[PDB]
Design a protein around this ligand. Structure first.
Ligand code: HEM
Ligand code: HEM
Ligand code: HEM
Lengths: 726, 722, 307, 83
């Protein structure tokens, strides 16, 4: 036995906070967490304990340390079938990554509606509040490879596979309510422009390069989603703290055959929260797996990601009642005009067992709809329908990708399709065609109906000539970017200006920067002037006189477009760094930990080395990480208890820890002699809003800190951070 | 409902003779036939009855007859996801066929040893007579594509997958005891030479072309297997009536670590039997699926193919005691020197459900051995070990081919291998490496032992320099071809001569024919002179004076090498054509069918049209096929009962049916007025005749059937125009 | 669409890092040639003054829109232009290398200092005036093709020699030894260093339980672990690291004499490495630092040279 | 895509056009063509938008579909005229 006698190799199969135990495959960490889909995967789960090591043919291996050779210092022999099988499997482990959204993190969970939506849709999964639908969700970036970093500036994907009783429904959305382009024909052009440049394959996970901004400057339809990407929306704190959107207008079809237009939404029950750029970029270096880790650990801790499914509903007769085209995916539907109606809740409560088998091999596709839903003529959605089926044939090695365990429906599936690479199903039907008499025509077609009926498309009227033509109704590019801009808080506006300024500063060809500034002048002159100033560009008199675009149906703002204008902060699942010293005041620590625990806020005990430290009362304190090992970037706030402050007062890493957290607008709390640290962050003796200070870490101290954490960041500090060298 | 009210669409789920019912997937035809492997495939079997038609995502389809269009006469829309899924699946159905042995037919069965072989091997599947091992067997040709014909002249493959309690063991053999080449390095050269020529991809399923005979003429090591291919061995009657061989010398390893050399054999319990060349070639045209059909229908009828596994055993100390090298795969071990010891029986008793899923996707590989077995340095076997794993990566789309249901072991399999295309298994092990402490090092290595131990190679002594050199002991090419030749009956010798003569007549470049005749002169002068005569070639004085090769260990023949020298005929499962007339003598028919039933011989009632005919007593006789629809090529014997012979006496197809059967040496039985047919077939040997069909008449016919063919008829068949 | 001042086009002359936009090699340095670079001319495709086409050679009129039934209508299945374009896009990716997936490459040439005919009959080492084109790829080991350059890892240093008597590939690393002794253990070692199976963390890092578990249980790994933990694991540039073949190979001369050999690459720019904090922060600020530095050094005329 | 192993089947010699072919498509299994275009997208300024679209015309023009009238509902229905 190679395991330690104390059993410390095995994580506790119960919820534990981040860092308390080693992470583990979901069925081992949470064996009692189940759903219909998770149970259905049992047939393909492979254990390991108490089993002999074998070849793939079931032959027991005696020596897994050596190749077969002619003498102990001789040549390796071709007859070593064990070596060749092992090396062959290894040599062929890789599969192509997804063209886009290659970097992603996934979890299992469930969905249930609040009430029956039978009135507006015949979709079975929305028919009954007590009907639970298992889900598998993958969150992703867009540009970067599967080995790229999480906290890049990008759009995020939010894909949900619903295992319904009437088929798989895939909700393939993003974290912004619009896309960059209007027609699917341009998707390869846009994606090639944002992706690493062809000659040298630089830059990874970044849109800050010439080709991207060249395309944007030449295709003003991109400006709306570019605004969202340049905002703090482009750098979420967690997959748990971002919104989700289907983007396209789809249709709901009820039993009577009535069509209602719908746009899909996911509301994060943990609230909306994003990083700041310097922190996000640094985090790509310090922990490129930050989001993947945070998701896995939140689930292991019982801080289950929860989202509310919502619908914006528009009657068929209201198709033309807005200033924009409902079928235009570069346009959002302001919630002030069409509210989001609450539909149901999704909870992600179990991690996969094997990332490759379940996450990498998962195939989501927006064409996977069910009776009660339908498409629209949105020309971006239209092209997506072709792409997803197509790409899966090479990525997943054939037309039998639905047989890969994660992708299988939990409901019945029977048809006349046969063969294809890696065919798992063994069909016993004497017939492989229909109509047939030899099997009495089974499996049989099913007429459409209110429940358990066959799929029939909504009989939408089509009138026109065969044309490759953009609708003139889609030819408006500045009003939605402006509405977004005006809906942001002043600090959110600053962050957008900084986003554009940083990105355009990386564009080598100055004329591209000038062309982008010209586009900004068509959106808002304050925005354009601020970006121009940072680039050492002067707006022309013509540019200064560009008439602003129209308001959107009389709206000059919609606060639902801001991350922070309307407080929705929730501290459960957040994390605090506690900076230890070699003689911690145990009374401070007791108060700190008790208060954090009560609000579901985790703590990580940090020091200048690993191991343990002893508190003033003899309590042995285990160290989670070093100041360098777990930087402030990875936490939401920092607390420094009293004790022997002299131990850490001159520690460069401890001082920098506070300077970084300060620069990144995080709440900081200093108890007793820890207030000596106010000098490194230039806090006046009188104090400052966002710095919690007291003689000890009492109830009032912790309440103040937790109130600041509910507000996420100390925006009032922004004017003060420029002076700090961090 | 589209099914007929009488239920005649559905085959009876019970054993029925060939042609009596439509054929069906195995688990519908024989639902109660089971074994551990067949049961383990239940998790992936999909039914159909009473289910709704869906997409692969489980969405019910309302209209599976139409694409989605803008108007009933409009363009098809890109949003039709149902159409695109259906067409996409269809568009991607095909996978690469096998490089060689692409044409094959398979079935499920079981194996059981007669006694424990614990004394000579620790292989678990041979440890106890009560130990039943499920098998999956695939029979094949070599050259032809998956769409080529069955009854070509070729070597046949005979591959057995044993689902053992200690791992999959694949016995990947052929129907001849040797191979064409000595070293695996030449395999692509040989195969390229026999395969269709590169410029034009001709000919299919035929070695009768210039490149094959060019290679043979330049590589005399090929001559032994060429002799077998030119003989009637190259055209088996059925996969049930051919021998099987592992070819290579392998090793058996016992619990004490003793190695015994072994060569594997399969003895057909239905006996050895082959077609004649004209019949075989014409059958490739009339029924290119003849062997596949015969196998499937024998199983459906309960005429289960049975084979006895046998071992030729040679002690390690006897490695050098023969005139040939044991490691040379172009050399056979004469049974007169080393007998075949009976080991066990294999029964094939169930067809697959889906040919593609189970047969096409099956992967056999000779490197798939188990503890108790080992390899030798045979340089052909050595290279095979590399090839099979390799080819399966592209043919079956990745390294997870063992996860394709037919290929899955029935015993446990656990290791640290992960990922790869179409990964099915979801590993829960916290570790994907060893040694590990995080999972207490599981799954763990197992030391070798008497039972349930890990695999350890036999510690064979290796001494020598790193050389790409053929052993001088392999440099003898004519003695085994001569042994084979001398062991054949005179009619078998004639068929060999005719095989070479026909093949070389299709070689365009005359010098290649001359070079092959020169090789034959090194084997036997009678053989060489007979082939030369047929090619209009004269042997030179030098050729006439070539000293014949040496005997093989003093043997000038071994009857075990002949198909027919030692009768081993079995009539069960054979088929007789009964040629009907519009007023059959019912008394003749009763006697015929009763006698055939008693011996398990099947009958097919033939006429000039389909439907029914009425006998002299009013009995309604259903017609199975027409004279043209089911030619004599497809049957073993022909019976013509009495009645209104005038109805068929002038029927060209009926007359030709008998002339073809006559030419092809098949037994023919004529009752009463049917004897009028003797004149039209120019007449002799193996013609049963009497006033009526009875005990005597049928006994005579069945005696002829046990002998397979009427060899005595050969001397004057050349003259018959058929 | 190009600016009238021509600022879109880089100068086809050596320029320092950041002075001009980077460009494809054949456009940046058109007069830099070798036998291999010339032999690739048959497959180089230009673009200027050519019409935009399908892969079948059909000129495209409108590359901005799908074919639809009306300007607000559904997309038609008969749009073969859209489907070809999207199909090619959908199938762009190929599997990355199991190991050394992250790598940066350049063309160059090799020339010996003297004939080595006395110790080897290898043609490319037979004459100091025999120039052998090369293609070199430098890499990390663990990380994906989208991972960062300045990780702590071993670096690959692979050279393809296009010899007159065949391709010789000298596939080495930047340390003189490997972690393991027998190839049978390669999947175990690589699985241990790679992201852990359950959650696929961490990327480009050996700082995790399974790696150190394996190391602790397999002391043969300790020598290369020492090199990886040293500043050798964080090179400043691919130009400032050593290369090694690791294995003992043989040289065979015309007389058939065998000499044992171990291969080395000496950086003529010297040996230099980053410091850990700098390296880790650089993975964040510029994950393409080494790839960029290599490309820009070549564009500047600071050609990487190795002995 | 599966028969010929990828999207570059037009590069297999027998399939290659004899006329010019230039576009912004890149990569794919067994990619033969080495593209030198600084741009892999359009519209682009970095390569003055080359290769460029061509208007339809009498000779050497770009492909444009005939503007056939479309009238009807989205249906999975066989025309009665086919019956
Ligand atoms: C509303 C705009 C869009 C959204 C919200 C969207 C979203 C996504 C998401 C979330 C994924 C990741 C799902 C997964 O893990 O498999 C993805 C994958 C993909 N998308 Fe999109 N997408 C959009 C438009 C497009 C378009 C226009 C195309 C192509 C014409 C496209 C082609 C693909 C392909 C080829 C993949 C990889 C597919 C797979 O391998 O599973 N997407 N998309
Ligand atoms: C004694 C000599 C040989 C015999 C009896 C033999 C027999 C067979 C048989 C029966 C099969 C088809 C099995 C099936 O899939 O149903 C086959 C397949 C094949 N053989 Fe052999 N073979 C011989 C030598 C060789 C050699 C020397 C090579 C290469 C070194 C070779 C390479 C292959 C390959 C690549 C296939 C296809 C394997 C596959 O795709 O499943 N064979 N062989
Ligand atoms: C001294 C030890 C080793 C060295 C120096 C070495 C070096 C390298 C390098 C530099 C590359 C990347 C070449 C490129 O730029 O594409 C590479 C790739 C690879 N190595 Fe090794 N390697 C070592 C050991 C191993 C072992 C023991 C194996 C397998 C049993 C192995 C299997 C591979 C494979 C499969 C790849 C990917 C090959 C490919 O995908 O082109 N390597 N190795």
């Amino acid at each position: 036995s190679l395991a330690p006698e104390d059993g410390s190799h095995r994580p506790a199969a119960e919820p534990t906070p981040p860092g308390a135990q080693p992470t583990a495959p979901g069925s081992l960490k949470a064996p009692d967490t189940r759903n219909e889909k998770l149970n259905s995967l049992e047939d393909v789960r492979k254990g390991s304990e108490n089993y002999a090591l074998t070849t793939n043919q079931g032959v027991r291996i005696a020596d897994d340390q050596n190749s077969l050779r002619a003498g102990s210092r001789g040549p390796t022999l071709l007859e070593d079938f064990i070596l060749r099988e092992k090396i062959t499997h290894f040599d062929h482990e890789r599969i192509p990554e997804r063209i886009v959204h290659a970097r992603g993190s996934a979890a299992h969970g469930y969905f249930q509606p609040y009430k029956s939506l039978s009135d507006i849709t015949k979709a079975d999964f929305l028919s009954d509040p007590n009907k639970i639908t298992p889900v598998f969700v993958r969150f992703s970036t867009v540009q970067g490879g599967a080995g790229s970093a999480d906290t890049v500036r990008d759009i995020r994907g939010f894909a949900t596979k619903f295992y319904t009783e009437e088929g798989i429904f895939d909700l393939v959305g993003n974290n912004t309510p619009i896309f960059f382009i209007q027609d699917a024909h341009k998707f390869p052009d846009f994606v090639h422009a944002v992706k690493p440049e062809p000659h040298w394959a630089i830059p990874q996970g970044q849109s800050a390069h010439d080709t991207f901004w060249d395309y944007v400057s030449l295709q003003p339809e991109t400006l709306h989603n570019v605004m969202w990407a340049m905002s703090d929306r482009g750098i979420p704190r967690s997959y748990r703290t971002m919104e989700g959107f289907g983007i396209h207008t789809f249709r709901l079809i009820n039993a009577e055959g009535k069509a209602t237009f719908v746009r899909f939404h996911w509301k994060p029950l943990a609230g909306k929260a994003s990083l700041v750029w310097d922190e996000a970029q640094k985090l790509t270096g310090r922990d490129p797996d930050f989001h993947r880790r945070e998701l896995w650990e939140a689930i292991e801790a019982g801080d289950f990601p929860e989202y509310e499914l919502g619908f914006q509903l528009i009657p068929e007769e209201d198709e033309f009642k807005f200033d924009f085209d409902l079928l235009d995916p570069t346009k959002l539907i302001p919630e002030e005009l069409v509210p989001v109606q609450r539909v149901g809740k999704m909870v992600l409560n179990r991690n996969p067992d094997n990332f490759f088998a379940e996450n990498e091999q998962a195939a989501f596709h927006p064409g996977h709809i069910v009776p009660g839903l339908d498409f629209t003529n949105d020309p971006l959605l239209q092209g997506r329908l072709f792409s997803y089926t197509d790409t899966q044939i090479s990525r997943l090695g054939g037309p039998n990708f639905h047989e890969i365990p994660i992708n299988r429906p939990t409901c019945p599936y029977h048809n006349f399709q046969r063969d294809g690479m890696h065919r798992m199903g063994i069909d016993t039907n004497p017939a492989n065609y229909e109509p047939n008499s030899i099997n009495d025509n089974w499996p049989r077609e099913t007429p459409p109906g209110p429940k358990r009926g066959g799929f029939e498309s909504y009989q939408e009227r089509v009138e026109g000539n065969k044309v490759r033509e953009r609708s003139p109704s889609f030819g408006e590019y500045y009003s939605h970017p402006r509405l977004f801009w005006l809906s942001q808080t002043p600090f959110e506006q600053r962050h957008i200006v900084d986003g554009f300024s940083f990105e355009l500063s990386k564009v080598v060809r100055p004329y591209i920067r000038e062309r982008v500034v010209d586009q900004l002048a068509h959106i808002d002159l304050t925005l354009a002037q601020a970006v121009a100033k940072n680039l050492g560009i002067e707006l022309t008199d013509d540019q200064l006189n560009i008439t602003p675009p129209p308001d959107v149906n009389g709206l000059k703002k919609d606060p639902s477009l801001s991350l922070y204008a309307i407080p929705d902060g929730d501290v459960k699942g957040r994390v605090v760094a506690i900076l230890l010293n070699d003689e911690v005041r145990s009374a401070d620590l007791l108060a700190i930990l008790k208060a954090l625990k009560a609000k579901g806020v985790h703590a990580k005990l940090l020091y200048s080395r690993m191991g343990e430290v002893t508190a003033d009362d003899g309590t042995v304190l285990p160290i989670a990480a070093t100041f360098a090992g777990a930087p402030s970037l990875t936490v939401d706030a920092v607390i420094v208890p009293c004790g022997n402050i002299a131990d850490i007062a001159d520690n460069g890493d401890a001082n920098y820890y506070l300077m970084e957290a300060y620069k990144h607008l995080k709440p900081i709390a200093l108890a007793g002699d820890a207030r000596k640290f106010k000098a490194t962050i230039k806090i006046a003796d009188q104090g400052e809003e966002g710095i919690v200070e007291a003689d000890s870490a009492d109830g009032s101290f912790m309440d103040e800190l937790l109130t600041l954490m509910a507000a996420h960041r100390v925006w009032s500090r922004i004017p003060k951070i420029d002076k700090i060298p961090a």
